[PDB]
Design a binder for these strands. Structure first.
Lengths: 104, 50, 66, 126, 88
RNA sequence: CCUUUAGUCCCUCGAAAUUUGAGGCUAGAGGAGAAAAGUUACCACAGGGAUAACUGGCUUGUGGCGGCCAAGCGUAGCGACGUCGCUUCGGCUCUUCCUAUCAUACCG
RNA sequence: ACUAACCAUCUAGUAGCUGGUUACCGCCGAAGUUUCCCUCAGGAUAGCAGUGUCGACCUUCAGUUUUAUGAGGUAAAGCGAAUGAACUUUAAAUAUGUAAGAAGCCCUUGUUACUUAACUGAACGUGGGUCGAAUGUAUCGACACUAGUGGGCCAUUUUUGGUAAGCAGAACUGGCGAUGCGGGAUGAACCGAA
């Protein structure tokens, strides 16, 4: 996410290379059958290692929070949704991209 | 050979190969032979065999 | 000395138990995520942005409120 | 349930209570008791290493421990054994007090009238 | 090497008095230090320890003397507090 | 004492007028005791346990994810080809071998 | 004020470490393991092997079957039996614990400091009744003493978990370790057979 940040001494030894960073993902909407490239906002839970969640590691089955403002989903209150969970459904390490399905 | 068939062969006096014994048929004895089938050939002898 | 002697001979068994437990935690986490997937698909009721609390209380609250 | 010392008991191991859970090997085993406490009961279970039996002294609770009927046949056999032996002496006819192991069957005839055989096929086509 | 605090080692009476000892695992009452006079006494000892070795005999005496006057002022201040609380 | 859950639209307070928010009630959930205690797939140091270390009919030209279709298996689930959606290093070498052929030969 | 070299001797200095450790034949012959103490490469006990003494004479025992009874009700059949893996009359395959005599079971009335409302129970005593499945048995047990052992590798079956695939861990059994021979052209892990 942020261009420059200062990390705690806990994690100041885990170096994450530039080439392995991703900012967007191909996210599929199950109900409205379409997929749009949506930016990634935050990593919520990596169900393999709590450290990976803190480090932002994107593996298969990882829950991420994405910006769904372009799709224009209308909530029960009549507002337009701006952020929803999405589960990565691929292996970004083997396939040079992130694919997710929206949890809607 | 598993330990269970080993004990039965000792109880039937079948210590070496081509050893023969006479057994009277009985549910006590019938089940014993049925466990040592992969090692024994048995049947009903006639008067000439006896 | 006594405590190290138990750590002496139980060391490898604790290794395998830890691996088994970590795999189990993976299964429960994926189950809870999969349970949320069914609930949203069946019905639900959200706001504009997702809940600010961590992704263990938020899932527990949502699966409880039904 | 009132259990005394020296009685043969059975262990069932139920999952209702997590306290005092024994190992799977000790589950479903029969042994004798050697000490009785308020809640736990100690039993002796001897297990083969390869030939020799080593007596594990484990503790189990009432909800898993139940008595056994292993000896009950033996006491049943001796009581009738006494009864017919005295009974046989009275009238004066011999009686047989050992149990014979299921001798083979003898010869007989089976009639076909009103019981005609039904022919079968390897795979039923009905 | 293990700390004597970790081990339950009894306290020993020496030329330094043990004083009134407190039971283990119980409320050792917090005695707050907030007066300027009480802080001055602690500060003088800290400064003396950091300075360390002084070659001048007179300068060594003055460093010890300022701690003595700090102690005297603190004792006088705490005495006046006791009198005011006891009387009023 | 505050916060969440469901309820009668049961009472009070505030707001706007043609409606709300916060309290209150019913019963579920959170918060021996200033001495210290618990906890972490994290860090630093010290130590301990399993382990010499990897690959051997391996490799090569056509991506992943989701939907539609789909012979079958089966009696909901797996399901290919297509289509849609998102995008240590360099140089030096001689002999021989391989073809996954740059050239020369012949063909479509 | 304070606190190099060579020669001979103490010295055949100190090792848990390296290398070595001398005819033949016969007989008996293993273990690689449970448990406890202790951190300083370890001890004790038990197991395996053997010797001596004593007691019984297949006396008695047994990695076995049968019988009875547990934990597995797991398959199956039916619902023209009821009810509805969680249903049942019945019941699989499969291993598996316990018990099967005179070293035994019940009754009985004398005492007892135990107990009971009580000669009432319990213990201590008395008497009573083909020795109570099969098969095998090249003996069984008790005590004392003595030496070598404290590893594991592979495979079947069951089972826990995981990977794209590998794989990792438990329980039993078997093969190899101390084993020659026949076969698979050859050969730690295969088949036959010692």
């Amino acid at each position: 996410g942020p261009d420059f940040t200062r990390r705690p001494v806990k994690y100041e030894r885990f170096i994450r290379p530039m080439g392995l960073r991703y900012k967007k993902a191909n996210v599929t909407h199950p109900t409205l059958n379409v997929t749009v490239q949506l930016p990634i906002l935050s990593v919520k839970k990596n169900p393999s290692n709590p450290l990976y969640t803190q480090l932002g590691v994107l593996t298969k089955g990882t829950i991420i929070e994405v910006n769904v403002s372009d799709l224009g989903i209308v909530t029960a209150s009549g507002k337009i949704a701006w952020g929803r969970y999405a589960q990565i459904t691929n292996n970004p390490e083997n396939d040079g991209c992130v694919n997710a399905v929206l949890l809607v | 050979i598993p330990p269970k068939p080993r004990k039965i062969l000792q109880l039937l006096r079948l210590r070496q190969i081509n050893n023969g014994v006479f057994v009277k048929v009985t549910k006590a004895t019938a089940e014993m032979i049925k466990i040592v089938e992969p090692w024994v050939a048995y049947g009903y002898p006639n008067l000439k065999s006896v | 000395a006594r405590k190290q002697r138990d750590l002496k001979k139980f060391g490898k068994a604790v290794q395998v138990q830890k691996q088994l437990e970590r795999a189990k935690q993976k299964r429960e986490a994926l189950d809870k995520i999969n349970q949320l997937k069914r609930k949203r698909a069946e019905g639900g009721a959200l706001g504009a942005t997702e809940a600010d609390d961590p992704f263990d209380v938020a899932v527990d609250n949502e699966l409880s409120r039904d | 349930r009132t259990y005394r010392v020296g009685d043969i008991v059975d262990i069932k191991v139920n999952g209702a209570v997590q306290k005092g859970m024994p190992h799977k090997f000790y589950h479903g085993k029969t042994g004798v008791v050697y000490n009785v406490t308020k809640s736990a009961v100690g039993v002796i279970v001897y297990k083969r290493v390869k030939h020799r039996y080593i007596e594990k002294r484990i503790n189990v609770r009432i909800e898993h421990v139940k008595p056994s009927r292993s000896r009950e046949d033996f006491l049943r056999r001796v009581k009738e054994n006494a009864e017919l032996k005295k009974k046989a002496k009275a009238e004066g006819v011999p009686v047989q007090l050992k149990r014979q192991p299921a001798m083979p069957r003898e010869a007989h005839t089976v009639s076909i009238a009103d019981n005609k055989p039904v022919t079968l096929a390897p795979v039923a086509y009905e | 090497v293990y700390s004597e605090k970790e081990l339950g080692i009894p306290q020993l009476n020496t030329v330094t008095p043990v004083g009134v000892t407190k039971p283990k695992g119980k409320k050792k009452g917090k005695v707050f230090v907030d007066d300027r006079e009480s802080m001055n006494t602690i500060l003088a000892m800290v400064e003396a320890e950091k300075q360390g070795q002084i070659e001048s005999k007179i300068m060594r005496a003055r460093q010890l003397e300022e701690i003595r006057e700090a102690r005297r002022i603190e004792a006088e201040k705490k005495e006046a507090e006791r009198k005011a609380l006891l009387e009023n």
